[PDB]
């Protein structure tokens, strides 16, 4: 009767940034989706592959759950098919995805009146991201014939610009936390059911 830890991943303090998104593997549940459904302020609660109302009696085998912090505008890009800055270089979903995308509005919790520069995002990559793949390669793009030995400047650019998140910005640039549930059914006896 061990209720599996959505509490370790929903009401947590410091969600990681989007370039290194932590991936909690939830397993051996008796998962109760009645604890997150009773909430007004969810900005998006879209689901794919399963209707969100009847999530109780649908037995899966593994339920991956991700987390990051993005702008309010770019929650549009956490969706199957859309491309841009976040779903190309930071966190890409495949177009057979079978889970839910949940957001918030955390401006009170994740933004001081000065520059909160603790969240980073990726600006470029040599190729687009394979679905569910994370890169922590914080190495300078060389981009010229000269090697520049890890100090940026002309012709050598850093691959992680910083978020700022001041609370005088906007409803679309104050930071929106996002937790992505992902359900899957790989060929093993049932594990997650409430």
């Amino acid at each position, epitope marked *: 009767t061990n209720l599996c830890p959505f509490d370790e991943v929903f009401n947590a303090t410091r969600f990681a940034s989007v370039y290194a998104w932590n991936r909690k593997r939830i397993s051996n549940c008796v998962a109760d989706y009645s604890v997150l459904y009773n909430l007004a302020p969810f900005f998006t609660f879209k689901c794919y592959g399963v209707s969100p109302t009847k999530l109780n009696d649908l037995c899966f085998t593994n339920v991956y759950a991700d987390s990051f912090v993005i702008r309010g505008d770019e929650v549009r890009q956490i969706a199957p098919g859309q491309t841009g800055n976040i779903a190309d270089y930071n966190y890409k979903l495949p177009d057979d995805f079978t889970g839910c995308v949940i957001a918030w509005n955390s401006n009170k919790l994740d933004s001081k009146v000065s520059g909160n520069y603790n969240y980073l995002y990726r600006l*470029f990559r040599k190729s687009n991201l394979k679905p569910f793949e994370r890169d922590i390669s914080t190495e300078i793009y060389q*981009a*010229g*014939n*000269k090697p520049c030995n890890g*100090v*940026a*400047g*002309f*012709n050598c*650019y850093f691959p992680l610009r910083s978020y700022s998140f001041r609370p005088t910005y906007g409803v679309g640039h104050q930071p929106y936390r996002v937790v992505v549930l992902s359900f899957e059914l790989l060929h093993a006896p049932a594990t997650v059911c409430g």
Partner: antibody
Amino acid sequence: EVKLEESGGGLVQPGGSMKLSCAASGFTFSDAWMDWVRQSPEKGLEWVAQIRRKANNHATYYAESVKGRFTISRDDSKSSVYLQMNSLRAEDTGIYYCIRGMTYAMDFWGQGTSVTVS
Amino acid sequence: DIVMTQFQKFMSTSVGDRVSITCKASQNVRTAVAWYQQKPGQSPKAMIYLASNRHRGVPDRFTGSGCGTDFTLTISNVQCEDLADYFCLQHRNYPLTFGGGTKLEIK
């Protein structure tokens, strides 16, 4: 917003010297690869010189056509970039633009100074 | 050194067409190519940096790509005031140079 200012539209007899300034505004001067280019109708656009960031020792590079005759020096206190040229000929005639940065973002350009020779 | 050949000094198109400004290089530069426009009587701007992305504040009609030794720029639905000069630039080695120029005029 960021704007760049430049001075010294001048006429010199061949064999003189010329040093021009570039005061900036609106952005952090201490990290910018402020460069310099040249416009002339006979040459298209040429590249002149460069002074790089603060963290890279103010690394300096010139065009090989004007080696020795020119020099550059920035100063982050007065938010300025000076470029000095000496012993000029009829080759170095033309408008000199003043660059915030080349070939990345923040690529703001000045307005040129009508620099000529006799 | 690294020279750029701009082999069409005058391209002639009208409104609603598709234009392809060209810029040939010397040898293989990886992605380090810039693209500048210059409205007549003013200072140039940045259209495309690093030959793939486009600048913050220019429309999506100005787009360009390519890799290798040859590069070009594509203008879709050219309006009444995209009428200017166009230059490409390499910055592989510190001998830097621009292109030569490309002047548009509506027929």
